[PDB]
Structures are given as C-alpha cells and as structure tokens.
Symmetry: D2
Subunit: 494 residues, 4 copies
C-alpha cells in the first residue's frame, strides 16, 4: 500500500553544502526552482558557480589527503556510514518522495515505491562492497613480490540530471564513497532540492566533512567548472549526448581527468511472432511511457514481426488510451508533466515531425491542460527508419511501432544507430533469445521483459550512449585507481 | 580425416618413474597388462607398492622444498613447460592414441580425435593459468597491510581410472602443476602404458626431477599407500563410489589430507514434448553409449514425455542397431570391448536384472564374440525407478528409457538418487530450460545437448558423485592453499 | 568504556530450536550446564540426540526445497535478514556478553568488547556478500552458451566448540546463510546458552522456519548423528584434531558429505634480533595467554634469536606476573578459569611434563583457588623441540620460549609439526619478513603483530590444523556448490 | 650469450597492411625512414593518410561482424593464434632485434635480450587469457536470470610511439586480440619497419584478414584520422601529453569513442638513509639512463636523504662516466643515439636550462660525434623543484639528484607534479616501504628496485600520465565491453 505525508511539505535546505556546512553563493545570487505541474516557483536556491565549485573541490581534496579520517578509517566503517545513510533515507522516505514528486514532476506512487526503494537498495548494495574492494598478489617474473592496491581515485565531480534526481544522486555517490573517493556533486538546476536534503542526512550520518559536497547551480557555469577543473580527478555524468561531448572535450583540454558518461538512447525492441504477445505489449508500453518518456532506456523503437504487427499496434493503442493526466501528487493520476519548457517544446516539435514525415498517428499528438508541461501520450504506427521520431531521442510520451519480416534485417536496423544503451527481445525460442541478445549492440538486453534495473547489475552504453559501467561488481572498477607495488626480494617461492 | 601409425606399436616404458629416472619395483615384482579386445598380454610392468610410493613421495617432497627449482621458477615458466608437454603429446599423437586404443579397448577414431585432442587442449588451457593464479590485497579492519598467497598445496597423490587414462592423467597433472604442486600419480592397473609414455615426455620437456612421479600398480596396494600416506598433502581420485569412501576414510585416519573425488553417476535426461526429437534422441544415445558406456556422465536414465515416448523409444532402438563390434583399431568398427572381466560380469548381471525385474528388452541383451569383453548394445524400455538398471551405475552399453507425464514429478525422480554428476534437459522453451536446469541436483546440466566437456568449464559432482571441481577457473582453487599474511603498520590509507 | 548489565541475568531459552519453535528432547532428557568459575549449575537444557537431529535435518531440508521462501527470496533479502540479526545482537550485547562470560568462563571485558563486536562485524560483513555471490559466463569451445551457478550446497551441519561460542556460531552461520544454505548447529555441550538466545533473535529477525535449527547436546550423540547423517550435505567443525578425524571418517562412511575442519595448532613465533623487542614480547604474550590459552592460534612456541633471548624471557616473565585471577564478571579481573575438568586436568598434566622433561619454570606451574578451574599463568624457558609442551597443544595459560641462532634451522623447527594454523614473524627487515612468511607452513602469518583476525580475511589451517578456509571472499566458496549449465546454440559469437 | 644476424639485414615490408594484403597509399606518396645513429635513409614506406585509415577501418569492421571467423572461432583458438605469433617472432628474433636496433637507435644487446623477450613473453601471456575472459551470473532482485557478456569492443585504433616500437605494438595488439577485437595500428613515423614485419607474421600465423591492419604514416594525418574516425570504437595511445589531449578532444568531438592513454612522466625516487646505497644508486641510474633516457618511467627526479646525498651523487657520477657511445649494433657500445632531431634539440635545450637555472653539472652537458643524434650522459646535482629539468620530461640521458631531510616534505615534493606514472622507494624499513608506497601518487611503485615491468602486472598512470591500465588481469578490462542480459523467468531459485 501507499502511505502519504500528513502535513504539507516545507522546504528547508536551499544552500550550498561544503565541509558539512551550509554556504551562501560567493556571488550572493540565487535561482528559482519550479513545480512542472503548476509552473509555479517552489523556492529559491543558492546559485553555485566556478568560485563555489573551487571551494568544494578544495574541501574534497583536503578530505582525501593521506592521513585524513576518510582515508584512514576502516573500509568496513565507510560501509557502515553508507548503511546508516540508507537507514536515514528510509526514515525520510515520505518527505523525500513528496519533494521528488513536487520538484521533479514525478508520479508520487512511482517516487515512493520505485525511486526511493531503489535509492535505499542501491545504497545498501554499495555499503556491502566497501570492505570487499580488493587488489591482487601477482606471480611476476623475477625475484619480486608484486601486489596491487585498488585505491580510490580522489576527487570525483558528479553531474546529475533532472529525470531521476535521487536515484542518479545515489548511483553516483554510493559507489564513489564505497571505494573511498570524495565527491563534488552538481544536481540539475531544475531539481536541486532532494539532493540538498540528502546532504542533511550525510551530515547526520557522520560522514567526515568534505567527503560529500553539493553545489546546486547551472550547467554552463558550475557544470563547466567541474568539467575543466584542474584538481578534479574524475567526472561522471548522465544527460544529453551534446553535453557529454562538451565535458569530454573540457576534460581533455584541462587535466585529462577520467570521464564516464551515460547519454541516453534510442533503444529498440524486437518482437518475434512466437512471443507472449500481451507480455510483450505491456513491457514495451511501460518501457517507452515510464516517467512520461523521460527515461534513458525508453523503448522508443518497437519492431514487430508482420504476422502479429497489427494486433500489437491495436493492443498498444488500447493501453495508451487509459491514462489520467494531472498533478503527480493526486492518487489515481497516472501521467505527470514533462520537466520544463525546453523538453516540452522538443517533444511537440518531434511529434509534429512524425505527422509531417508520414507516420500514422494512432492516438494523442498534442499538449494538454491549462498549466503544467503536459503532453498527451502518443503512439505512431508505420514508422520508418529515416524519420526523426525513429532517429532522435524524444524523452517524451511518444511510442514508435515498426514492422519487420526478416530477422537478419531487423537486427541491422536495431543496430543502425549511434545510440546503444539497451534493447529488448521477445520470443519463446531459446536459440533466438541467446543469439539475438548476443548480436544487439546494447549495454543491457532484456529478454521477455523491459526496464529491469537492479543494483547487482552493471549498467551503461555501447557506442555514443556512453562509456563505462555503473553499479554491479564491474561498475566499482571505475571508482578505483590501480597501483602496482613491486618489491625486490632475495628469492621468491610459489 | 583420420591418420594412422604406419609401423606397428612397440612398448618401451614399463618402469616406475621417480626423480625423472626409471626404477624397478623394490620387490622386483612385475604385473601383466592386457588388450581387452583380444584377452592377450601386451607386456609386463613394474609393480609399485607401498615401498615405491614412499620413494615417490620423498622425491615429490624434495622437489617441493622452499628454494627448489620448481618452487623458485617463474610461474610463466611452469606454464611454458606445460605448453611444451602439450606440444610433445601432439608430436606423439599417433603413437599415444594407438597405445590408448590397444591397452584401453578404446575406439581409435575416438582416441585420436577426442581423447588426444582433449589432452592437448586441456594442457594448453592449464598452461595459460600458471602465471594468472593470484591472491588478494584485503582492506582489513585496523592499521594492518593484509595480503594472501594462493600457494601450491604440496605433494598431491592422483589415482587415475582405466576408462579415460590419458585424459584423466592430464586433468589431474595439468592443474596441479600449473599451480605449482608436485605429484605422485597411480594409473589404473589395467592401463599404465600411456601414462608411462607421458612420463617420457615430462622428462623430455625439462620438468625438474621429482615434480611428476608415476607409480603403476594395484589399488589396494599402491593406491592405499597414497590414501594413507602421512606426507601426501592432497589426494584426487576418479573411480568407483566404493573406493572413494575407502580413500576418504584412509585420509581421515592418517593425516587429514585434502580429498577431492569424482565417483560416477546415474545421470538423467528430461525430454519435453516440445523438444527437437531427433536432436534429443541422438544426444541421449551418444550420452549413454559413448566409449561402450564406460563414462562417468553416461545418460543412463532417459525420461520422455508420454506424448513422444513411443516415437523416442522407436528411434533410439533404430540408432542402437547400427553398431559394428570388433577390434577398436580396425577402421569402421564402432564399438569396442569393455575393459576387463569384472566390468563385463557386472554389465551382464545388471542386464539380467533388467530382464527379470520386468524391463522391456528392445535390442541386445547378451555378450558377443569369440574373444574380447564385448557386450551387445542394449536398450530397455518401460524401466521403473525401483529396478536395479535404474538405480545402479552400469558402466556398459545399456540404455534405460522411462516415461513421465508430470514435470514436477519427473524432476523429483531425476533427483531421487545419491548420484549427482550431470543431467540433460531437452526443450525449446526458455523458461523450462532455465528453471529445470536450476532445479536438477547435478554438477553439469546440458540443455539440448549432452556430454559436452571442455577445459574452460568446471566439472564435478553433487552429492555422492563426488566433491570439488576440476578444470575451469574454479577447479584451480582445489590445487592451492591460501595463506593470509597480515603486517602491522603505523597507519593505513585506503 | 565498559557498560554492564544492570539487572541480574535470567536464563530463558533452554530448548531445542527447530522450524523456529522450541522443542523438548524426544527422550525427555535434559543436561546440566555449569559456570566454570564457580563449578555451580546455571540451568538445565534439553538434550538433543540422533532423533532430534533427524527432526532438525528434515526441517532444514524442507526449507531448502526448490520453490521455498529461503530459496526464492532475493539474495539482497538474505543479506537484509543477516544485517537485522546483527542489529539485534547489538541490541542484546550486554545480555549476550554477560551470558557468554558466565557460561564460558570468559573475561567480560573481552566478551563485550571483542567477542560481541566480532560477532556483529562478521554478520554485517557476511550480509554484504549475499547478493555479490556470482558465477561465470564461460567461452567454452564449440557452439554453446555456458554459464555457472554458485548455488548453496544445502543442509549444513555445524559443530561448534566451547572456547568462542558466539563467535564460532556466527563464523559458521553467517557465510552459510549468506550463500543460501540451511543449517543444523550443535553447540558445545558446555556452552549452549548464547546460541539458544541467538536462535530467539533469528526468529525475531524473520528468517523462514527451518533455515536455522539449533540442537544442543553431546558430541558422541548429537555430533555423531550429524557426522553420519545421510541427508546432510556438508559438515563444518572446529575443535580437537581427534574429533576431526572421527567426523571425516563418519562422513566418508555415510554419504561422502563435504567436510571442512579447523583443529587447533602449535603455532610458532620467530623473533629476529632486529625486532622491536617490546612489541614482540607484548604480542607473543597476548598470543599465548589470550582467553586463558584456549585459542586455536595460541602462540605456543616462541623462538627468539640468542642475542636477545635472555632479555625476551625476562620481559615475558615480568608481564606474565601481572595477572589477577577470579570471576570473569568482576571488573579488573584479568584471567578467568579454564572451561571444565577435562581441560584443567590436561593443562596440569602437560605443565608437569614440562617440569619432569627438563624445562625451566620461570613462574606459575600450579592450580589456583578454592573453586573454579583456575591455572596459574605459567612460563617455561629453555624448551626443546622434543618435549611434550613443545609438541602438544596445551589450550591453557602456558608459554614456551626457545632460543635459536640459525634462521634456516629455526624455520625447519617452526615447520616441524603436523599443525599449521598460524605463525608470527618479528623483524624490521623487509626481505626477511616476506621470505620467512612465505616459507612458514601456516594458514595465517602475522608480521610484527599476532592474533589479528578480521571478517575480511580468510582463516584456516595448513596440514592437520584443518582443511578449507572461513570468512573473507575465499571462505564463501566452501558454502557453495558449482553447477555448470551448457546450452547448445546455432552459432556463438565472442 | 648474445647471438647476431650473420647476413646483412634486407628490408622487405614497406607497404600498408589491410585485409592481410599489401597496399600502396591511395595518394601514391611514400616517406623516408632513417637510421638515427647515421642520419642516413634506410628505405621508403607507403605514407598512410585518412583515405588509407578509412580502408583499414572498413576491413576491421568487416572482420568484427557477427558471424565472421574472428567472432565465431573458439576463444581458445584466438589464444592459439597469439601463441603461434609469439613462436614466429621468436623464430625471427635475430632479424627483428637487428631491425629494431637499426631503425630505432636501440642498443642491440637490449633489443635482443629485453625488447624481443618482452614481446614474446607478453604475447604468450595474452594468449593464455583469451579463453579465460569471463562474465558473471548475477543474483538480481526479482524473478529474472541475469548474466553478463564481456564482449570485445570492436575496432580499436592503436597509435604507437618510436621509443619501444615492437614492445608497444605487442602491448597493444596482444590484449586487444586476446579479447576478440580488431585493430588498426599506426606505428610511429620514425619506426614503421618492425611493425610491418610483424604484419608478415600475422598473415603467416593464420589470423583472419582484417583482424590486424597496420597503416604507417604521420601523426597529424593518419593518427588524427584514427582519433576522429566515426567507426572506431576505441583508441589507445602512448606518447606525448600534448597529443593525448589532442586525441581525447578528437574522440569527444566525433563519436565519443573510448580512450586510454599513457603519457610519460616525471617519476621520482625516494632514497632513505637506511637504504642499500649501492643497490639504490644502480637502480636509479638504470631507471633514468635506460634506452638513452627515452623511457616513460625514467627516474628523472632522485631525492636522497641528506646524510647520504653526497656519497649518492659521487657514486652516480662515477657510474655515469663509464659509457661508450656509438652505433647501437657494435658489441660493447653502451649508449646509442636519440631518435631524431626534435628530441635531440629538446634534450640539449633542457640541459642548457639546467645550467642557466643554477643546477650543478657533474658530468656530460653537451652533444657527441660527427653524425647521429648523440647526447653525452649528463648528471645534475643540487636540482631544485622549480627548475625546468625538475618539471619537464626530458626523454634524454639526463639525471637530476636532489636532497631532502624531511620525509613528510619529500613525499609532497614527489607528488607535486601533474605526472604520475611510476616511483621508486629505497629503504630497508618495512613500515616505511608500505606507507611511502601507499602515499605516492603513481601507477607503479618499485621498492628497492626500479624499472621492473612484466606482463602479469597492470601498468599505467595516475593523473596526467594517463588513464586506464595495460596488461595484467586488470588491463584486459579495457578491451572489453560489458553487456548485461536479463531474462524474465517464472520463478528463480538461489
Ligand atoms: N610515454 C612514452 O613512452 C612517450 C613516447 C614518446 C614520446 N613521449 C613524450 O613526447 C615527447 C615528444 O615526442 P613525439 O613528438 O615523437 O611524440 P608524439 O606523441 O607526437 O608521437 C607518438 C605517436 O603519436 C602520433 N601523433 C603525433 N601527432 C598526432 C596527432 N595530431 N594525432 C594523432 N596522432 C599523432 C605520432 O605519429 C606517433 O605515432 C617526448 O619528448 C616524450 O616526452 C612519451
Ligand atoms: C626499463 C624497462 C624497459 N621497458 C621494457 N622492456 C622490455 C620488456 C621486458 C619484460 C617484459 C615486457 O613486457 C611486459 C617488456 O616490454 N618494456 C617497457 C614498457 C614500458 C616502459 C618501459 C619498458
Ligand atoms: Cl589488479
Ligand atoms: Cl584470498
Ligand atoms: Cl565458476
Ligand atoms: Cl560483469
Ligand atoms: Yb650534425
């Protein structure tokens, strides 16, 4: 069941968080934060810029110094601190999910039952790794003793998007901290509020000062200061392909800092004629419409074998027509607004491209409501590979359905994109499930499901959907720096 | 294609191999070795007993001493020696396969194309691991530096069976040597000859003396001396369940040496109605009839969904009727003899149990020929779970076919055995393949195939089919002893 | 600081724990449990025997069945249950440490600050592994998809000793449960009480019934029923070398169950002339006198370079003369009783052997007090390798100090034992620390410290000190059974 | 001993290698290749440019297609091909070492005994990993089966420097191929010749066409075409910090390809007063003077405790005065030329900076000879942290020796650089060796040695010395792309 907050939400944390203390901006400037369902201002927040990032990096550097509390404490104690943080987020789950829904335009049902649960579970998963990060002893040639340290890297700048503010915050800080790094986080200008509340809880949990610093502010200002900073060792980023390139270029130009990116997708589904049809329709629908289409792994190209294409389209239209738009905080509402005017415009323009380029509009196709950035859930049939709605990430509630009859050819079509984040395959045939999944150039492939993400799984893109992996055993590698220590000895023995 | 030896085989190596030199038995006694297809003596071999095992252990201990060549050489050089050994076995492939076929009663086609290839591939696989065996550096609580060494264990006694003499020899010595152990090998009394030729090649490859010692002889004599030896650190064994118990009891009684066993099976296949029927018939047939049924993983219980049972039986009988019995060295012969009189008697007695207990004899059922331990390939239909041919490992060319209609119940029947070595599942359904394979209590489960063994895969039994795993990454663990080194330091840093 | 329980301890849990319910013994029999510091009975406990073990195994088997809650719950939820159990033991830390001290004769300071802390930390460590136990995908030869499952083994029987009742309980159940096994635990007849209280907390934490079953009782009765049980898949044991052999023999005779043992030691220290002398004296003293000498890793042979031997002996005698004997619950008491009459007799007899065989008694040498199994802390100088106090594990407060001058020779002396659990090396020289530690045949080697045990480190014996490893990454391997699944596919791709 | 080629070297392979065939440049243009010891032209080579890189990428892409020989062959066969290549390089060791010495200006003794041996050993090491690259099976939340594939990435562009042509070639192609990638290699314009001979041997070994393509040519032309190519999935590079930035910027701008860099260093040694002084002098000398100073890990800042500084300097000057300059092919010659005029000028300019900025010139300081790019081996004493010879990588035979007295301060000085490739620590004290090595911000730290590189060790930079690691287990991660496959199932079981 679905509990709610019983007193109205009051916003408290609006300042920059450095050395576990709350800071005004060096400039004195603040910026507004809005509710996307009402277009009304919720509060003002201190606007971080290069001077504030500089303060946060110096604090993160000082907390990372050899001999510091965060460097010398037991690994197991880093893990305890992360488990306590998860306990505290659990405690404040009602408040955080409400704030997430109100600032982010996110259905409260999903914010409470999915986002917040995933934040808690991911933190507890990361806590468990902290004292299980291990190097190696190595039987090198010659009379030497050689071992490796999987050290933390150092100061990690972490630029977060607006579509999953808390979840991206925890996906970034959980592994970074578990491995022993210090972090400077720049949440989305649209959604700073839940991150600043979590900073409240980082202080309360007892993390040493400077281990986590949160600098709300804008992209070209505070984000770019992180990108180009000469004393940040690594930057991680989720967001647009265009910013990813600007960050990688900034990193190369300054100090050759390590960079990992996750950059969205144009993720395809392949539905074979032998698929459980209803199960395939339901998962592909959820794949593309989840959180108003504002998901990196949105299932935005659905290829269906011709034998079942018309039934698939018909059943998808029926399911898309069952939504209730409105304020994401009211029970029974099933689709909230898009995040802001930029994204709203982009979606409507792409919808229009679909009409003009010859797609078949099955439902939706326009905006909704007196206020709020609402888009009707929209389904296009007979989409072809050349159209803009087939090539460009939409990030809105807009489903594309295509037909195929040759399996060889539909795999090339699925792979014929610079994106590569995820894909889905729907079949009952063992051999097809394995060989299709092996052939798809995508970081996660779901078989007879879609959108299944868990802390135990590495997650990331092929090709221009990004580089590196997050979470799982494998994602922890990207938050360590390997040092080889080789000691001369008089005689080695196996 | 299938090349052959162009001059008749001459036997050269018949003595005990210790410190890379050839030894007469301390007693002076020798024992005969026979050809199972003719019942004729091939040669005499030095008979090892406790006094000879004692000599081999002392040499293996001396080669394992700290500061010795085998302990101090680079890991990568251990690997080079194993690759050279594989090169030499490749060179002598015609001779070894001929000797294997003549001493072991093994089809020459299979000895040359399967056994010898697997020996070569397994050695090269093991060679590659030698300098990739690694310990760990560990973020222990407190101000300490902690690392682990995955050392070799020490002197490993390795008791080999007669059904795959070369392959079992290499499965044992490949991982043992790669990890840095020294070994005392006791090949089957029935099949010492290929092992002694490989000892020729171990000397030729340059292995330091005492690293490999081979002591041909009998089980209750030389085998038991290994089992109960107070200076052997580990014993590995493949063979009967009954000897496994005698070895484990001997080990516990003497020096608590480490023990790994592989002990055969009563491995089941489950054939669902949606299976590729011909593919299932072919693989299950090969599973149970390979090497005259003398395989640990023989598919000796085949459960078939009632819908397809009668067709399955009919097609299996047709395939079983296509064999040519005779000397395993003549081209076109497709079934050789059983290994000796004990096994031959055991098979015929169990065949008779099948008749008397009410099984349906579809073909075969008796012996064959003027000489040689030949058994007609035999198929039983309508087998029930209580019969001896359903409960006891036969190790002969004897196939059991049963019907089921409830999948829940057939999984319990498949699992209702103290054996647990392997199993097979035949279905096109993804979900059934995964959930059935997960539910079966068996060390290897094949899906839509059977009998697929490779050096990259760990291999071993559940339950009384044995303990531990051989080959793969995982099997290397059982040839190392982990040492934790924990060093006090003034201050640790992550 | 050191808090205490403010009301006297009341014993509540005295029955057999099966399917999360409290059971009388099938026989109706109970047995007394005593306080070793007073020789007075504390309470009576239900006496488990073969019939009760049979009940516990059936429940553990049923909880392990495919489809059961414990088999189907998320791995991460197994970990949550273990973290909650740790939270509950933390809650009851005062009660548990008091009960541990009163039943076990264990200094309350140590029980509270060391045993209980280690129990809590070890559980939290094990919790973190639960959803990080992973198998492999393997690039086998041929057109196959091959993966491995690291399944739980099944029903694990766990026989616990009296010297560290809670810590051994958690060392056993933490990894077993994390990996997904079910357990039947048989605590020491002398110390059932803390285990039964923990069973209270396993129920309270929400573990499914039958996952943990605790059967207090005697060794030759309930212990032997576990050893020889035909439906227990694995047995783990810590205790005497003599029982280890009886367990391994019992396992071999019945169902070839997997066996891991830890069997004590005769662990040596090597003190070089360049060692920090005071640091070496302090750690070796603690090594041998900790918990009245009743530690598996007791530093019971201390070899000291002749240059510093007399100073080392003198300083060790001074430190041994500073103890206060008495009831382990009174503040300032620094040495408690031995556990029972058997151990007390054994210690006094061995002390007498030391006198008669010619050792130099420096202090102690006799019993103490009106009541309680107290032994004076005792130091022997000029010990030689032939004496009983040099060869036999004493398990009492009895220190042996020997001189050496040749480093080659003292390593052979240190290694000249069938034991092999641990060792210590004291030197400032890098090269000596590495090469000596590499040469010692011991499972853990401490350098410039002693007795440093942590959940992140694997722990176990070389040679007759046992087989397998506990805790660390590596120890988790011994609570899994590897299954290889190999799937035929039309075409594989790298 | 040191065998030599008995007939003069004849150059044969001068063309572009694509699809295992030899190609003229699209332009028809060729470029000269010189001997640095004589300044004479050795031959002309086809000049690759963007059009030729385009041809090589298309071939590498085609060889990487699903269903291709290189994608479908057994992993173990990829390893066989790499072992055969190593066998062939061994066969041609005399020719390759001669060609390496003549084109690269590299002492023939070192080319034959070190470079060529390292090439052979590294290939054999990489061969062994090929069928040991494994993914995972993962206990994800929910009723799913989740596994990972560690796939090859795809087409990898590999830009090689002139200082270790063969060794860098093999460090790049060995791991790339072992993991299953295809490669487009661009050797240094100064040293294409040994790479083109190895391409001869790749064809001879049987690698499928298009798996390895070698495009000799210039940096701003063919190198930049690789950097910015829209169908290259990854680029690896060793060379200058300045090009690294140009490559990272090019990659970000085009297709966000993965990038790993190794970019040289300013690697420091710390020599404590208790060090084995002669051992420290010898290793630091070799560290900075090896291959005429043209090593990434050159020990170009040597900090020595004041107590021993003057003796250290004196002994280093004595050892530096013992060199014989001349043609690297004549026996007994111990220092060859620098590679070309650019590097020669850079070294002399930096030497002059040392004089003018106030360093103490102890020996050398000018050029040498009638012809060839020879620099006198040069030692500077009393170097301070501000001078150019302390800050800038020299890549010439130029040693800097500084004094320290505070260990805290000398660690900050050692770390006060944007470089971070390697470091050395010389002490007998265990605690100092561990804590100093832990505090140094460097990818490899040697203790009481220097310059010890082996295939089993990961190798790479901290900070601006580069990103990622090469060789070892860990370096293989950077040649794979992880795919998560998550399959919906009816019910999971642990
Ligand atoms: N880390 C090393 O081992 C290493 C090796 C060589 C040079 N260096 C450093 O670089 C300094 C200058 O030497 P250099 O100019 O010969 O090195 P460089 O970086 O320019 O050349 C090395 C490789 O990079 C290529 N390259 C050059 N420009 C390129 C471009 N725009 N795009 C793509 N590839 C390009 C070159 O053709 C060559 O293959 C040296 O003095 C040294 O300090 C380091
Ligand atoms: C001062 C070291 C010279 N040196 C060598 N010598 C050849 C060599 C020898 C052994 C193993 C090798 O590969 C693992 C190998 O390449 N290779 C280097 C790579 C980078 C920096 C310096 C190098
Ligand atoms: Cl590593
Ligand atoms: Cl380990
Ligand atoms: Cl495995
Ligand atoms: Cl993975
Ligand atoms: Yb000149």
């Amino acid at each position: 069941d679905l509990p709610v907050l019983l007193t109205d939400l009051k916003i408290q944390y609006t300042k920059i968080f450095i050395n576990n203390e709350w800071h005004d901006s060096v400039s004195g400037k603040k910026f507004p934060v809005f509710n996307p369902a009402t277009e009304e201002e919720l509060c003002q927040v201190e606007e971080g810029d290069k001077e504030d990032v500089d303060k946060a990096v110096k604090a993160a550097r000082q907390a990372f110094q050899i001999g510091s509390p965060w460097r010398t404490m037991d690994a197991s104690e880093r893990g305890r601190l992360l488990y306590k943080l998860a306990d505290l987020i659990e405690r404040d789950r009602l408040l955080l999910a409400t704030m997430e829904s109100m600032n982010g335009g996110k259905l409260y049902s999903n914010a409470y039952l999915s986002d917040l649960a995933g934040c808690i579970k991911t933190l507890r998963y990361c806590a468990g790794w902290a004292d299980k990060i291990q190097g190696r002893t190595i039987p090198i040639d010659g009379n030497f003793f050689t071992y490796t340290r999987h050290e933390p890297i150092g100061v990690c700048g972490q630029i977060i998007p607006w579509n999953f503010p808390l979840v991206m915050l925890i996906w970034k800080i959980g592994p970074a901290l578990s491995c022993g790094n210090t972090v400077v986080v720049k949440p989305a200008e649209q959604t700073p509020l839940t991150a600043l509340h979590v900073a409240s809880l980082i202080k309360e949990a007892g993390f040493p000062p400077g281990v986590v610093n949160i600098v709300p502010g804008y992209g070209p200002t505070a984000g770019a200061a992180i990108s180009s900073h000469m004393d940040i060792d690594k930057v991680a980023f989720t967001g647009s392909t265009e910013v990813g390139k600007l960050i990688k270029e900034a990193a190369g130009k300054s100090n050759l800092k390590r960079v990992t990116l996750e950059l969205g997708g144009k993720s395809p589904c392949i539905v074979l004629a032998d698929a459980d049809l209803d199960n395939a329709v339901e998962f592909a629908h959820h794949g593309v419409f989840y959180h108003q289409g504002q998901c990196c792994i949105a299932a935005s190209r659905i290829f269906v074998e011709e034998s079942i294409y018309d039934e698939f389209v018909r059943r998808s239209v029926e399911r898309a027509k069952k939504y209730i738009l409105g304020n994401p905080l009211t029970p029974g509402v099933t689709q909230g607004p898009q995040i802001d005017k930029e994204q709203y415009d982009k979606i409507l323009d792409l919808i229009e491209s679909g009409k003009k380029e010859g797609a078949k509009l099955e439902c939706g196709g326009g905006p909704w409501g007196n206020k709020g950035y609402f888009v009707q859930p929209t389904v296009f049939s007979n989409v072809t590979d050349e159209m803009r709605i087939a090539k460009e990430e939409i990030f809105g509630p807009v489903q594309q359905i295509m037909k195929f009859k040759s399996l060889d050819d539909v795999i090339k079509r699925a792979n014929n994109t610079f994106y590569g984040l995820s894909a889905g395959v729907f079949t009952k045939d063992i051999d097809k499930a394995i060989t299709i999944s092996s052939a798809l150039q995508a970081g996660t492939v779901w078989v007879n499901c879609y959108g299944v993400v868990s802390a135990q799984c590495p997650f990331g893109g092929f090709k221009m959907s990004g580089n590196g992996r997050e979470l799982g055993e494998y994602g922890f590698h990207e938050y360590t720096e390997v040092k080889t220590v080789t000691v001369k000895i008089s005689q080695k023995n196996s």
